[PDB]
């Protein structure tokens, strides 16, 4: 698969933050249906900035 929601669901992520990213991807799939990978990438970049 290339779908972000499917990729995140299939791989069993264990860290809680990754679980909430999976839930975010599900929500983006529900509301829009595309941009499922982009939203996860955006969230990751945002938190990366939050580090600094």
């Amino acid at each position: 698969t290339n779908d972000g929601a499917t990729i995140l669901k299939q791989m069993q992520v264990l860290h809680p933050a990754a679980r909430m990213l999976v839930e975010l991807s599900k929500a983006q799939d529900i509301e829009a249906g595309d941009g499922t990978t982009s939203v996860v990438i955006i969230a990751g970049s945002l938190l990366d900035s939050c580090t600094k």
């Binding site: 698969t1 290339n2 779908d3 499917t6 799939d29 829009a32 249906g33 595309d34």
Partner: protein
């Protein structure tokens, strides 16, 4: 993965979304009105948009596989020996009662089939039944002798979709079974996918109400699943256009503009 086939799938997805909504009034799209059927074999080039109904069930009759000017009837009761909701037993005390029971059961089944046939129905869909035989073998024999295609084991969850598609009102008691509750259709035939299975397609309906079917085919199962996911993504994007009538450029342009 379906990018070389986009010339086939993009118009297909747009047609599928437009066929299930009213463009002048629709504010959202119910994607459950678009049914996707995955059949192994062939190539994604063989993906087809069916304007009618596609059923994976097998025709019980042998020798009747194509009906023109069909009159489909949907049945939610059982064509078998009479059986009440309460506990029922038939007590036999004489030898004559045995063949009387046999004859009366045959007459009951024959009367049911005759009442069904009198309405002009020629394609019969029988809902899946438990605790009671939906289709008795004797009933199947009588229906076959009267030139009626019989399809059984119809799932309960699909009744709404079938009724919305082919315009058939479900019948739960034989008394209410009349001609006005039949769904007229142009053609109901069972096609064969070149030795990869069979499909029952009912194409051409007098009342094609806001429902379309997509048949997805491919060489192996993995690409079929990915094609289904991709087609779903395309349908969701057209749904987004329906919900919010606004278009933006792509290729990172919104992100660059947003950052600047």
């Amino acid at each position: 993965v379906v990018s070389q086939y986009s010339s086939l799938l993009s118009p297909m997805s747009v047609n599928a979304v437009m066929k299930v909504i009213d463009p002048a009034t629709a504010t959202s799209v119910d994607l459950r009105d678009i049914k996707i059927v995955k059949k192994l074999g062939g190539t994604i080039d063989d993906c087809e948009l069916v304007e009618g109904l596609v059923l994976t069930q097998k025709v019980s009759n042998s020798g009747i596989t194509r009906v023109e000017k069909a009159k489909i009837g949907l049945i939610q009761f059982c064509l078998s020996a009479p059986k009440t909701d309460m506990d029922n037993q038939i007590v036999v005390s004489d030898y004559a009662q045995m063949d009387r029971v046999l004859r009366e059961e045959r007459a009951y089944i024959l009367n049911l089939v005759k009442q069904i046939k009198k309405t002009g129905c020629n394609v019969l869909l029988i809902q899946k039944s438990i605790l009671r035989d939906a289709l008795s073998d004797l009933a199947l024999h009588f229906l076959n002798k009267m030139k009626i295609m019989v399809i059984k084991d119809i799932e309960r969850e699909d009744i709404e979709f079938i009724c919305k598609t082919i315009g058939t009102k479900p019948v739960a008691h034989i008394d209410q079974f009349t001609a006005d509750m039949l769904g007229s259709a142009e053609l109901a035939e069972e096609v064969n996918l070149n030795g990869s299975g069979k499909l029952l397609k009912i194409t051409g309906c007098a009342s094609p109400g806001k429902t379309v079917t997509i048949v997805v085919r491919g060489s192996n199962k993995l690409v079929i699943e990915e094609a289904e996911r991709s087609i779903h993504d395309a349908l969701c994007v057209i749904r987004c256009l329906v919900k919010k009538r606004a278009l933006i450029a792509g290729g990172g342009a919104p992100e660059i503009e947003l950052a600047l």
